[PDB]
Structures are given as C-alpha cells and as structure tokens.
Design a protein around this ligand. Structure first.
Ligand SMILES: Cc1cc2nc3c(=O)[nH]c(=O)nc-3n(C[C@H](O)[C@H](O)[C@H](O)COP(=O)(O)OP(=O)(O)OC[C@H]3O[C@@H](n4cnc5c(N)ncnc54)[C@H](O)[C@@H]3O)c2cc1C
Ligand SMILES: Cc1cc2nc3c(=O)[nH]c(=O)nc-3n(C[C@H](O)[C@H](O)[C@H](O)COP(=O)(O)OP(=O)(O)OC[C@H]3O[C@@H](n4cnc5c(N)ncnc54)[C@H](O)[C@@H]3O)c2cc1C
Lengths: 401, 401
C-alpha cells in the first residue's frame, strides 16, 4: 500500500505538506522530492502581496523542518515515469525507483493566444522568478494592464497602485472574481478598486497588440508599459497524461489521493477532485487545499484507518485595505448580509444558505467571524436566520453549540 | 494484474461484450456476472424501435455464446463491495470473492422533479419492463406527451405516430438532439417530425400536472393519457461512490478501464472517460461505446501489451423514415453538406471539419457513406473540401487512399 521508497514530483506547498505529514505520522523509509525550480521551497501567496512590495524571498520560504531525512532534488525536471517499471526519468540523466509515486506538480498560468506574437512586455505571475521580473518593471507612474478578473491580478493591482503605478484591467465577464466569489463581494471589490484609481473594463477581451498598445474587441486600444496576464491556470498533468492516467486539465483523484494508476497518487493544484459541498469534481486552486489535501493523503497512506480528505474549500485574498476571506460555495438560495457594505471602513460578513443550511461565507476585514462560520459550514448548520443577520449575535457561541 | 476470479456487476451490453472478449482472448479462470434484471441479457436499442412496434423479446437477446463458462446471476442486485476484502455483497445473502471487479452497471433515466407527485401515468424508457409498460398504453388515438428532445423520445414519437397515437413533445432547449448532433441535422429532424404530425413545443419546461393535464412554464397546459420522460440518464455509480472511487455522475476511468481503486475497473454507460476528439472527459451514452470499450478493456486485461481503448464515438438513431448515423463531434469550424436536405426522399451527408481536418460526420439514409467517413475521421484526414462537397466523389476510394 504505502510502499517504499516514496518519490514526490513537485516541491511546492502540497509536496512539502505531504512529506512533513509522512514523517510526523511515522513513516521512516526513503523520501525523495524532485522540484524543477532551483529555489528553496517557497510559498506563493506572498508573491502578489508583501513580496511584490518588499522583495525579501527569505520571508517566504516553507518550513521543511517537520520533514527530516528528505532529499530535495532542486532544479531538476521529472520528464516521464514508467508505472510498470516503477521508475521516474530525470532531466539530469538519473532515474529514481519508487514504491509510491506522488504527483504534486501544480498548475501554470494560461497564456493569452492573442498576445502570442506581442512585441511589448507580457508576463504571468506564478513563480518567484515571475514576481521578480514583474517587480523590476513596476516603475512609479508607469502603466500596467492586467488581463483577467481573478484575485491574483487584483492583488497585483492593489500592490501596483500602492507603488504609484497606473493600472488598467480588462475582464471578459461582467464582474470580477467570477470563480468562487459571491456577486455581492465581487461588486463591492470592483467599487473598491475603482475608488483606488484602477481603470476597470468589463465585458472586454484582448484581440491583439501593436507597438506597445493592446487591442480590445470593442475596437478600442489601451497603451501600457507592461501586461500581466491572469486568466487562470492549467494543471501540470503532462507526465500523468503520457503515462496513461485519467486526466482532464487535472489528474482525477479520489479522497485518498489515488489516481487511476496503482501506486500513483496526486495532490494539490494538479488534481481534479470532489468538492463535498457541490458534490461535483473541480480543480481546486487554493493554498488550503494544497496543504490540507497533502496532509490528508499522507496520513491515510501511513494509517489506512484514517479517513480520506474531507475538508471544505476556502481561501483568502489581500487587496489593499481589503482582507477578504471566502469559504464554501459562492451562492445558494439565500444570502444574509451581516453589517453594512461600505467603502467607509469596509467590514462585513456574507452568509450563503441552501434551504436554511449554511453552504458558504465571506468575511471582509472580519477574521474573528470567519473561523466560527467555517465550523458552522462544516456541519451544515441550520441556524436562526434572524440571529444570523442580528448584529448582536455572537457566532463563536453558536459554533461551540 | 488480471487476477482471478473475475466478477462483473451488471449484465448489459458492456458486460456481455467484456466477458466474451475475456474468453476469446484466452482467459480461462472464473467469471461471474451479477445482473439485477431477471431477464436473459438483451439489447436496448430495439426497445424504442422494432420491439416497441412488434413486441417479441426473443429477437432482442444478446449472444452470450462467445462467453462460455460464465455464471450469470440474474435477478440479483450487488449491494456493496469491499475493495480491501475483495468481496461483493449480494441481495440474496451471498458474497462473491474477486481478484478483478468490473463495474458495468449502466445508467438510469433522470426523473422529472415537477412530475414527482403526478396522478397520471408517467414513465421512462430504459428497460424491457419499461417498454412493455409503455407499449401496453400506446392505444390508437390516445395522446402521448414526450418530455425531452433526445433521440430515444424521438424514436418513441415515430413509433407512436406509426401506431396511430397522437404525440406532443416538450423540450427545454430551442432544438432537438442538443447532445452530439449537428444543428443542421437537428433542424431537419424537427421538420420531419412536425410533418408527421408531432406537436413540437420548444423552449418550454414542465412545471407540474393536475388531473391528467401537464403544466408548462409559459402558463399553458397539455392534456395527455401518458407522459414519457426522456431528459437524459444518470450513471448508476452508487456502489463506486460508497466504496471510495472517484465519481461524478459516472465513474472516472482511463483508457484501460481502471478506476481510482486498484483491481476495480468500469465500462460502458456508467463511465466518465476521455473523448479523444475533444480531449475532454465525458459520459458517453452509446451502444458502440458499451461494446467497444468492453472489448478493449478485456483485451488489455488479458494482454497488457494491447493498446488502451481508442475508438472514436458514434451512434445511430432510427426515427420513422429517417435512418440517422452520427460520428465524432457535432461541430467544428466548417460544415460541408453533401446532397440536398429535403423532406422529399431524405438522403444527405454532413461533414464537420476543424482547420481542414474531419472531426465529425452525419449520414441520413446513406449507410454507404458512413463507413468511409468514420475511417477518414479516425485518421484525422484533411481531404479536398470541394471534393468532399462534389457529389461525384467516391468516399470509399478516399478512405482506402
Ligand atoms: C501569486 C499567487 C498568489 C496566491 N495567493 C493565494 C492566496 O492568497 N490564498 C490562496 O488560498 N491561494 C493562493 N495562491 C494559490 C496557491 O499558492 C496554490 O494553490 C498552491 O501554490 C498550490 O500548491 P501546489 O504544491 O499544488 O502547486 P505548486 O505551488 O504549483 O507547486 C508545484 C511545483 O511542481 C513543479 N513542477 C511541475 N512539473 C514538474 C516536473 N515535471 N518536475 C519537477 N517539478 C515540477 C512546479 O514548477 C512547481 O514548482 C496563490 C498563488 C499564486 C501564484
Ligand atoms: C431505449 C433505448 C434505445 C437506445 N438506442 C440506441 C441506439 O439506437 N444507438 C445507440 O448508439 N445507443 C442506443 N441506446 C443506448 C445503449 O443501449 C446504451 O449505451 C447501452 O445499453 C449501455 O450498456 P451498458 O452495459 O453500459 O449499460 P446497461 O445497458 O444499462 O446495463 C447495465 C445493467 O446493470 C444493471 N445494474 C445496475 N446496478 C446494478 C447492481 N447494483 N447490481 C446488478 N446489476 C445492476 C442495470 O440494471 C442494467 O441491467 C439506447 C438505449 C435505450 C434505453
């Protein structure tokens, strides 16, 4: 079952979390991790946040201390694996044997086809190298165009505005954060960014570019010194596809992290997995999934009596003055708004319900509300909805009860 | 790998095809098939076609002759399996051991929630029992309402009209055959059915029913003596879900038929699998998939050097005077029409292309064109598009070349 030696492909958060849990759970056999980036393993959320603003990579490294006795092959690419021979072929000419192989290769930013032949700077923001490259170009009074309405681009937008950079943003949909964000939140977030000077263009797509100017599908133009594309990511599932595993922009796994190939597991951004709230398979793209799924899969490998991965989804985003936290589903049949939604000292909570049952929650500048709401969400609580609205109500009391 | 004994859950076409191929390929160990219907294994396409019209079940049985030495447990339901203990629990109190378990449990018609409390006859059409029940009610001059725009309902519509039954049809979309049928075909098919007296209602949904009358979302009513619901099917994946396999309205499998649980495979209508033309996972709902996927998975189990399942999708439908055949994708960036599209002696061929490459084809009353088109499709031929249109052109010559 858990057969030594263990080989993990990828050295991001999912991998680090997985190998630390293997050790903590008591597995003492060989663990080897192959990571294509020549970087001490590091966390990505700071890259569009404090790192983009302050530049110290030694504040963003992951703690591999809870993972003793691991050989990390950094700067090495796994090129293929042979699931019959139980081997992995590496870019440096070496081959690793495995008893258990774990694919934790993450995802990469989607390229924008219309900007393929561009003769102006066009970047994406995924790696430390990407962040350093973008940061090197955030000159005060320069012009940045962000393509896409997702959180990472909005975090970059806020960071750029704080740095004195002019920011325009083009999104193909009618709202920001179309993925897993309640409309009420998305609308407020647009109002916030507009108030901070972001030039927002909804329902537009990029059709191309000429001599430093980006073209839009309404026949207009946006001049910029740099474009940062953030229209989503694609799973890094090429090795899985070539080896015959079931994949579709993501490696399909069950709650034990098993792929369709025996002795091969997958974790984190590279996986397509069940969302227990929707009951549908989705590629979850969050820090909490990478950590939590890695831990759960490791725990169950060492102790097969342990339950499978069962945590419900959530994420956060830091956009200037907005500390955003979102859990569960973006919508149900009812939204309750706790507090006022205002640009004057923003602070509010949203609760999404389905037939009286909490299926999601949002907190903006209210971390204290978020933890008990996630607990109510996890048990599918059906609380009094006037109480949920009632600003008197203490949610922590509710959660403990 | 292929470990004896073999147990298959489900005794439909996928199962029969799979076990016959195991025997033909040379596997000589135990094979036991569990089938919940107390019926000699039978094919479903006749149920909305000649069986509905003539009623002889002994014309629709599957040939199990190429599957010698198989014990068929008919009228028995598999209630669960334990993938650790390698056992299956049966409804008759017995337990089967397995070395290799194969889930071939098909799919069941979706119920229409708005008709749940109906006090008039409401049926679906999947089984021999269903067909006999519906047929018993096809009284000449009675009124039948079909809900859904799919092929099975249209086949029933044609059969009913031939039997002197008045037929109305409600579809929520703007066209018939919204799934895997080119719009050109769907439009023609509607014209055909309307000409044969079917009362077609597009862009309407059923909101309920009262005392023998069905209610629609445009505020109107349709009286009927019988409703047959055909709004699609849902995979019978409950045993897989309970046992911890990756599922989402269908059991995920790779091209070897492997699920995420070692020693457990799945075939046919119950699977969600890669469509090589789209490169996306889909639940394929066709006779040819059930047969071909069953054969390919069996072949590779006996001979691991054999390739995985690789056949491209296709189906046919018999609707009165229309013998419809459809292969590949419904659309690309180009459609070529061979022949005239006319209700006067219907006979035409459609070819769908993507950047010059054939990605799909349709034949109406032209079986001779269909076989070479499927061959051109399989190799992704890029033929001369004037030649493809040119009625002189012989496609069989093209295919052999
Ligand atoms: C800028 C940014 C900001 C973010 N902010 C937040 C946030 O505030 N909150 C939040 O919830 N989430 C956030 N995320 C998301 C989060 O960081 C991801 O969910 C997480 O990184 C996924 O971890 P992972 O280990 O699965 O994948 P990854 O971090 O992508 O790690 C995979 C590693 O494997 C490597 N690899 C791929 N193929 C091979 C190969 N063949 N051989 C060797 N190595 C290979 C990759 O290059 C990569 O280094 C952010 C992400 C980014 C990029
Ligand atoms: C009326 C009709 C007309 C059709 N016409 C066409 C056509 O013209 N062309 C075409 O391409 N396709 C057609 N099809 C589709 C085609 O028949 C299916 O794709 C095919 O039946 C799928 O085969 P299967 O073996 O995967 O599933 P099934 O035929 O559904 O067989 C599965 C069997 O497993 C049983 N089962 C489920 N759960 C259990 C359990 N726990 N224990 C034991 N047994 C269980 C089921 O009850 C069923 O008997 C038609 C289908 C129908 C219903």
């Amino acid at each position: 079952a858990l057969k030594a030696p263990v080989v993990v492909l990828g050295a991001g958060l999912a991998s680090v979390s997985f190998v630390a849990e293997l050790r903590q759970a008591g597995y003492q056999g060989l663990i080897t991790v192959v990571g294509d980036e020549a970087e001490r393993p590091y966390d990505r959320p700071p890259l569009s946040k404090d790192f983009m603003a302050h530049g110290d990579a030694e504040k963003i490294r992951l703690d591999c201390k809870r993972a003793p006795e691991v050989e990390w092959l950094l700067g090495v690419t796994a090129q293929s694996f042979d699931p019959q021979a139980h081997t992995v072929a590496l870019s440096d000419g070496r081959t690793l044997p495995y008893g258990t192989l774990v694919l934790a290769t993450g995802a990469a930013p989607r390229a924008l086809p219309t900007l393929q032949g561009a003769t102006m700077p066009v970047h994406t923001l995924r790696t430390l190298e990407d962040a350093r490259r973008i940061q090197a170009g955030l000159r005060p009074q320069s012009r940045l165009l962000i393509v896409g309405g997702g959180v990472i681009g909005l975090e970059l937008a806020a960071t750029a505005r704080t740095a004195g950079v002019h920011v325009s943003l083009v999104a193909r949909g009618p709202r920001l954060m179309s993925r897993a964000a309640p409309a009420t939140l998305a609308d407020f977030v647009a109002r916030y960014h507009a108030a901070q000077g972001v030039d927002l263009r909804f329902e537009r797509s990029v059709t191309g570019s000429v001599d430093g100017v980006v073209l839009l599908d309404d026949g207009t133009r946006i001049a910029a010194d740099m474009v940062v594309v953030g229209i989503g990511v694609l799973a890094n599932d090429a090795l899985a596809r070539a080896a015959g595993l079931a994949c579709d922009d993501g490696i399909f796994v069950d709650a034990y992290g098993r792929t369709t190939c025996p002795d091969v597991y997958a974790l984190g951004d590279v996986t397509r997995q069940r969302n227990p709230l929707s009951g549908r398979f989705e590629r979850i793209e969050t820090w909490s999934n990478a950590q939590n799924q890695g831990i759960a899969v490791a725990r169950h490998l060492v102790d097969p009596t342990a339950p499978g991965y069962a945590e419900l989804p959530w994420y956060w985003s830091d956009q200037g003055a907005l500390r955003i936290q979102v859990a569960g589903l973006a919508s149900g049949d009812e939204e309750i708004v706790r507090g006022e939604v205002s640009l004057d000292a923003p602070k509010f909570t949203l609760i999404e319900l389905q037939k009286g049952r909490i299926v999601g929650a949002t907190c903006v500048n209210n971390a204290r509300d978020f933890a008990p709401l996630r607990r109510l969400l996890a048990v599918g609580a059906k609380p009094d909805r006037a109480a949920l609205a009632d600003p008197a109500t203490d949610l922590r009391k509710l959660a403990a009860a």
